[PDB]
Amino acid sequence: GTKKGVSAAAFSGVTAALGDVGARWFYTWAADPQGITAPAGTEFVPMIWGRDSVTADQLQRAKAAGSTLLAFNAPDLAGQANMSVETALDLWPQLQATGMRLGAPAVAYGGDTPGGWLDRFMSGAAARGYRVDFIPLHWYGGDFSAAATGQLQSYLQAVYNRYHRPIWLTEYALTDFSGSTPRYPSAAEQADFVSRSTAMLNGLSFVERYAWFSLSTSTTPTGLYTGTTPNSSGVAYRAAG
Ligand SMILES: OC[C@H]1O[C@@H](O[C@@H]2[C@@H](O)[C@H](O[C@@H]3[C@@H](O)[C@H](O[C@@H]4[C@@H](O)[C@H](O[C@@H]5[C@@H](O)[C@H](O)O[C@H](CO)[C@H]5O)O[C@H](CO)[C@H]4O)O[C@H](CO)[C@H]3O)O[C@H](CO)[C@H]2O)[C@H](O)[C@@H](O)[C@@H]1O
Ligand SMILES: [Zn+2]
């Protein structure tokens, strides 16, 4: 019912796609829907992406566009928000001052690692008396077998066990980035993982929300829909609770 969402971008048919797949919520990596008209029953969640995303105007835009706030995207990656724990802590009061339910920055990896980016952020927030309501995560599996769903579950459990905040999974797919270019599963491998991973997540009481990366093949080869047509993975996501 309540957990299943998606990342999305404006394309011809986005509204129908969101409706047909049964998304309860969506985000755009921006402070507003970036031209997308949401179907009825589909909640937009704003994001404050990076350092230069933190202005009065963006924070007010976000608060008018929704009731929950996602903080910086992959601050631990040079190619994304690319930010120190200290820069993220120093901007935090501006995000807190909106009064919105507030999600931690979403780390690319290492969320459970002592001394990692997330651990220093949460440790510093607690010492400053800051509020962090939930922890959003990213996960991309390189093992394309039936074992993948268990590997994802282990990472989510470890982050819950470390910080005891409710968990969102705001990007997930099978993709191996270890090599010089990305490596993807066969279509049948992907659809089996969609089924087994959603069943696992729908039943895990400390996961509040999840978002397959991503709605549309025009964003990523792991896309669920081309225009308004679902592939076997979109079919599997639509059939999830
Ligand atoms: O200071 C750091 C950099 O600041 C930049 O300017 C900011 C500007 O980039 C930002 O615009 C938004 C885009 O960042 C955003 O792009 C989304 C991607 O972040 C996302 O990346 C995922 C990633 O999270 C995951 O780990 O790996 C995925 C798989 O490889 C990867 O794809 O992908 C999304 C899908 O393509 C993509 O949309 O999109 C937003 C929505 O359009 C943009 O708003 O906005 C900021 C202002 O609010 C700018 O400060 C500079 O360009 C850089 O030079 C700096 O290094
Ligand atoms: Zn400082």
- Nearest-ligand number for the alpha carbon of 84: 2
CA of 125 to the centre of ligand 2 (A): 12
* Burial annotation 21-38 (CB, 10 A radius, 16+ → b, else e): bbbebbbbbbbbbeebeb
Site to substitute for ligand 1 among 34, 44, 49, most atoms within 8 A of C-beta: 49
Residue owning the nearest CA to atom 46 of ligand 1: 53
Q: Which candidate, 63, 104, 73, places its Cα nearest to that of 7? A: 73
**Residue 155: CB atoms within 10 Å:** 20
Q: What is the DSSP string of 146-159?
A: TTHHHHHHHHHHHH
Q: Which candidate, 44, 41, 45, 35, places its Cα nearest to that of 12? A: 35
Nearest-angstrom CA–CA distance, 44 and 158: 28
Domain limits for position 12: 1-241
Residue owning the nearest CA to atom 38 of ligand 1: 29
Q: Give yes or no for a contact between 240 and 199, defined as CB atoms under 8 angstroms apart.
A: yes
In the block, which residue shows the tokens 């507003």? 32
**Residue 203: CB atoms within 10 Å:** 10
Ligand 1, residue 78: give the atom nearest the CA: 56
Q: What is the DSSP string of the chain?
A: --SEEEE----TTHHHHHHHHT-SEEE-SSSS-TT--PPTT-EE--B--SGGG-SHHHHHHHHHH-SEEE--B-TTSTTTT---HHHHHHHHHHHHTT-SEEEPPBBSS-TTSTTSHHHHHHHHHHHHT----BEEEEEEES--STTHHHHHHHHHHHHHHHH---EEEEEEEE-B-SSSS-B---HHHHHHHHHHHHHHHHT-TTEEEEEES-SBTTT-TT-SEETTEE-HHHHHHHH--
In the block, which residue shows the tokens 């992406």? 49
CA of 85 to the centre of ligand 2 (A): 9
Q: Which candidate, 5, 41, 2, 45, places its Cα nearest to that of 23? A: 5
Structure tokens at 236: 């599997």
Nearest-angstrom CA–CA distance, 22 and 4: 8
Q: Measured in whole angstroms, how far is the alpha carbon of residue 124 from the centre of its chain?
A: 23
How far from 22 is each of 172, 234, 235, CA to CA, in Å?
Answer: 18, 10, 11
Q: Measured in whole angstroms, how far is the alpha carbon of residue 78 from the centre of its chain?
A: 18
Q: Which candidate, 209, 168, 241, 167, places its Cα nearest to that of 3? A: 209
Residue owning the nearest CA to atom 44 of ligand 1: 30
Nearest-angstrom CA–CA distance, 26 and 24: 7
Nearest-angstrom CA–CA distance, 220 and 54: 27
Angle, CA 160 vertex, CA 157 and CA 164 arms, to 5°: 155
- Nearest-ligand number for the alpha carbon of 81: 1
How many domains, the chain? 1
- The dihedral over CA atoms of 220, 19, 2, 110, expressed in degrees to the nearest 10, equals 10
Q: Give residues (CB < 6 A) around ligand 1.
A: 28-30, 34, 49-53, 73-74, 80-82, 108, 138, 171, 219
Q: To 10 degrees, what angle do helices 117-128 and 85-96 make?
A: 50
Q: Give yes or no for a contact between 3 and 240, defined as CB atoms under 8 angstroms apart.
A: no
Structure tokens at 89: 């802590």
Q: Give yes or no for a contact between 237 and 215, defined as CB atoms under 8 angstroms apart.
A: no
CA of 34 to the centre of ligand 2 (A): 32
Resolution in A: 1.9
Ligand 1, residue 48: give the atom nearest the CA: 48
Nearest-angstrom CA–CA distance, 144 and 175: 8
CA of 84 to the centre of ligand 2 (A): 10
